[PDB]
Amino acid sequence: GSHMGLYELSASNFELHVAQGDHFIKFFAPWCGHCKALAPTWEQLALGLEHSETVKIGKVDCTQHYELCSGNQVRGYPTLLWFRDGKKVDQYKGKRDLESLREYVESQLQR
Structure with a gap:
């Protein structure tokens, strides 16, 4: 039951997966x-x-x-956690509707 764009991580791969870039x-x-x-x-x-x-x-x-x-x-x-370059950044506790999530993503990608 996979979905396009959606990673499903495990104990084996999680840390290696979030090591570079930004992750939600x-x-x-x-x-x-x-x-x-x-x-x-x-x-x-x-x-x-x-x-x-x-x-x-x-x-x-x-x-x-x-x-x-x-x-x-x-x-x-x-x-819902944000990671950047292998570290936990935030615990997002805002509204969970699609447009709010997109606005939060954009807010975390200003670097």
């Missing part, structure tokens, strides 16, 4: 109702940014790769 990652659990509610929006976000040279859109299933989650202080879901 959805940490989720399949059981989480708010996560289900957000999933189509996140898929739209990924599709629209599929060809970006500056940001990649990802997700991590914290039921499968929990150490990634606890190691990034993820304690509930969905948690």
Whole structure:
């Protein structure tokens, strides 16, 4: 069940994946109702940014790769984190609609 533009990371590849550039990652659990509610929006976000040279859109299933989650202080879901050049930058707690997410992405790509 893959989606264009949307990376699905694992414990093996997560740190290597976020090492360069900017990343916006959805940490989720399949059981989480708010996560289900957000999933189509996140898929739209990924599709629209599929060809970006500056940001990649990802997700991590914290039921499968929990150490990634606890190691990034993820304690509930969905948690939307920004990474830049291998480091955790922000925990985005703003509005989660597509246009708000796009505006946040653009705000984090001013360098």
